[PDB]
Short mmCIF file of C-alpha atoms (C1' of nucleotides) in Angstrom, two decimals:
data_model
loop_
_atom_site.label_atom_id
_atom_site.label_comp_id
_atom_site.label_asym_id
_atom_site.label_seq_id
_atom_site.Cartn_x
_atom_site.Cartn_y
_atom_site.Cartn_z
CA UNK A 1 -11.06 33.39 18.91
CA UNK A 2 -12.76 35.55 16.15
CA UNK A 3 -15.58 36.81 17.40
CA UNK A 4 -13.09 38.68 20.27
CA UNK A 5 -10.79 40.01 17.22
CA UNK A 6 -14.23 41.59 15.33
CA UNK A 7 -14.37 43.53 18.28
CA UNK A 8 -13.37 46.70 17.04
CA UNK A 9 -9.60 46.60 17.67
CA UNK A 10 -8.62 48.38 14.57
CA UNK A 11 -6.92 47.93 11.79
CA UNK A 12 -3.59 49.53 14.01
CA UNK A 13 -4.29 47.80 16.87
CA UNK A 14 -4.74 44.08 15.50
CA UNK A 15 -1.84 45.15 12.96
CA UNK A 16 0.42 45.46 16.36
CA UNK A 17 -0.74 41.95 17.16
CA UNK A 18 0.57 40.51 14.29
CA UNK A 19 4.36 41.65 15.49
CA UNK A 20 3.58 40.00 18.85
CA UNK A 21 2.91 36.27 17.53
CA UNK A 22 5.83 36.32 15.07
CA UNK A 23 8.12 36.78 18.01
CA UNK A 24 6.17 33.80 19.52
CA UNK A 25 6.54 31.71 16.34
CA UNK A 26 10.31 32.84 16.35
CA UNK A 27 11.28 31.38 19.55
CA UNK A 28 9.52 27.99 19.28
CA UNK A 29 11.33 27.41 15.89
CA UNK A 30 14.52 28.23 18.12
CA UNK A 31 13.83 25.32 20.86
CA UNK A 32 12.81 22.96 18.34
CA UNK A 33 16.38 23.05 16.72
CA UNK A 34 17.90 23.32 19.68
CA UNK A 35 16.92 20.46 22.18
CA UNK A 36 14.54 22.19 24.56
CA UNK A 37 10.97 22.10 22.85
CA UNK A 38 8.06 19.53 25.11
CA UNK A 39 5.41 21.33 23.94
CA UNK A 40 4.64 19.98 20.46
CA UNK A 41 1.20 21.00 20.88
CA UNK A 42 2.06 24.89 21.11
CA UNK A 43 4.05 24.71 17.73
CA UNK A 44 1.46 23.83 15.57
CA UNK A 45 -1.19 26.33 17.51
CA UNK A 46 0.34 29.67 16.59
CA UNK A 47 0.13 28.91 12.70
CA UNK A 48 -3.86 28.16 13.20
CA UNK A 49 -3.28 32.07 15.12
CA UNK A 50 -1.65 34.02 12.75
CA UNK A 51 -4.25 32.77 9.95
CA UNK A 52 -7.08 34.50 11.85
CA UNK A 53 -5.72 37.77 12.40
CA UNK A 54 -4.80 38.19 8.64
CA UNK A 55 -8.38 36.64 7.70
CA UNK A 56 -10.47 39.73 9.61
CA UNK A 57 -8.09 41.97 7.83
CA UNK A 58 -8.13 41.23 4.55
CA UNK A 59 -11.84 41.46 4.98
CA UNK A 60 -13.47 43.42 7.89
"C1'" G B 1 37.72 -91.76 10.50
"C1'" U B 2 40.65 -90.97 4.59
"C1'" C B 3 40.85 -89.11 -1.47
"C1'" A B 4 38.09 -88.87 -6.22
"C1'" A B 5 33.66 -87.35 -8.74
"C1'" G B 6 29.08 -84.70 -9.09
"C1'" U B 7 26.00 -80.58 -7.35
"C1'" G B 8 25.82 -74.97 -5.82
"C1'" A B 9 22.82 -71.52 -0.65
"C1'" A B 10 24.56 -67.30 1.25
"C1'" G B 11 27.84 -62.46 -0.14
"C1'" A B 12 25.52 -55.84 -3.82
"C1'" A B 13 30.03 -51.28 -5.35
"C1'" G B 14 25.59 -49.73 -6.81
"C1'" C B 15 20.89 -50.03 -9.15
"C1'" G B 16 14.91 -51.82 -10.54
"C1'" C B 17 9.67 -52.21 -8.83
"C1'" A B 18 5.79 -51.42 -4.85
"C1'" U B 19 4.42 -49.08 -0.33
"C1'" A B 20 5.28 -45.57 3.91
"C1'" C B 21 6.73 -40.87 5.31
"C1'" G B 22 8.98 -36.20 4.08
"C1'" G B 23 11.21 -31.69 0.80
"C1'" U B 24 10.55 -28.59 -3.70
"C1'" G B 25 6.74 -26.43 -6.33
"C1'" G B 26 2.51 -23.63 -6.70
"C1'" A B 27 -2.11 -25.96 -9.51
"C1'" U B 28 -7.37 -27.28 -7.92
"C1'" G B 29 -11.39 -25.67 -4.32
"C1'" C B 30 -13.73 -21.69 -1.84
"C1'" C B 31 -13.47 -16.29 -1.61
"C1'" U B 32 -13.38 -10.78 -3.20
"C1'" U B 33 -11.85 -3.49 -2.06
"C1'" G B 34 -11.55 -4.68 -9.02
"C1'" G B 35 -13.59 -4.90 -13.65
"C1'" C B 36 -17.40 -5.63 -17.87
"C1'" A B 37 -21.89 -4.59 -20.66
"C1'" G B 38 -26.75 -2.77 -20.31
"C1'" U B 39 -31.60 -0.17 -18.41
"C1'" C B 40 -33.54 4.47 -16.62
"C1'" A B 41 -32.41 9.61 -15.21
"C1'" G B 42 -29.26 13.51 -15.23
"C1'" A B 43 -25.65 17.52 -17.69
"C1'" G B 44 -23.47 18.46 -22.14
"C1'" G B 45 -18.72 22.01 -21.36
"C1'" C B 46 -13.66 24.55 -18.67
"C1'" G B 47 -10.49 29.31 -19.76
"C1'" A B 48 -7.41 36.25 -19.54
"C1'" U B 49 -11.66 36.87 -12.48
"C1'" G B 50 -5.55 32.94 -15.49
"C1'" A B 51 -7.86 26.53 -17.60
"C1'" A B 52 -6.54 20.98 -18.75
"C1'" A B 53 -1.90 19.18 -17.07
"C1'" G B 54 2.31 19.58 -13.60
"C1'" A B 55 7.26 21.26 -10.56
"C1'" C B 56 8.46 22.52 -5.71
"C1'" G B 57 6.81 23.22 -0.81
"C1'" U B 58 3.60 22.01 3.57
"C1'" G B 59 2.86 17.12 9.51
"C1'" G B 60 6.11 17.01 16.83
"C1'" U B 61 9.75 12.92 14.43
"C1'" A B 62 11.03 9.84 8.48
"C1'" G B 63 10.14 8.13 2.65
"C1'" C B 64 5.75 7.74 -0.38
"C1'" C B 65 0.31 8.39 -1.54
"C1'" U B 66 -4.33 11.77 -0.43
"C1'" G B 67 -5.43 17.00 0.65
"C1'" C B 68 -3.96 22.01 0.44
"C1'" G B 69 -0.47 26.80 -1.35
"C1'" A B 70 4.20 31.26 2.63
"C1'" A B 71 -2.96 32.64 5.77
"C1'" A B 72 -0.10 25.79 3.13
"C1'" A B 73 -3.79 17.74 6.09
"C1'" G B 74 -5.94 24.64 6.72
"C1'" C B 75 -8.89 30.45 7.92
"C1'" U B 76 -13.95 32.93 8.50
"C1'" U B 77 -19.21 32.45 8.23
"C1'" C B 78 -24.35 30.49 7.76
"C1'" G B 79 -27.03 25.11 7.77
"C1'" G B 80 -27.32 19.77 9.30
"C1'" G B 81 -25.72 16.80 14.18
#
RNA sequence: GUCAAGUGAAGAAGCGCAUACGGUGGAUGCCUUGGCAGUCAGAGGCGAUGAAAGACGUGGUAGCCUGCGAAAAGCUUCGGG
């Protein structure tokens, strides 16, 4: 959620969390072209993700 | 049981008229998400903080509309339920 990202992390430590998610988004646009990808509902959840963690950076 | 003479109903290839059913065709009837003109109020501007108008892109699958813009049918906050 937000309200756990406004606590403090930083702007390091939530900057490392960015590099986590894109691995996640990496691997389910893998599956998907490949034929092994059920979860439909996990592809369009990390987008919705990565949009938070840039939104408390560009403003604090 | 005979000839001669007189008379002339049927028969329709196909058509005409009337009715009875159909086919084609989309009128009439009834109906409206759309318009049309007024009355009374607003508000009369948008743009170098990048406009009016668009191209391309965005959805778990596929074209087009409607929304958005690599943070892309959305993100964070207050308020209403």
């Amino acid at each position: 959620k937000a309200n756990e990202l406004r606590e403090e992390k930083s702007g390091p430590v939530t900057g490392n969390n960015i590099s986590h998610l894109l691995r996640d988004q990496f691997n389910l646009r893998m599956q998907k072209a490949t034929g092994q990808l059920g979860q439909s509902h996990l592809l369009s959840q990390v987008k919705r993700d990565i949009a938070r963690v840039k939104t408390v950076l560009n403003q604090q």
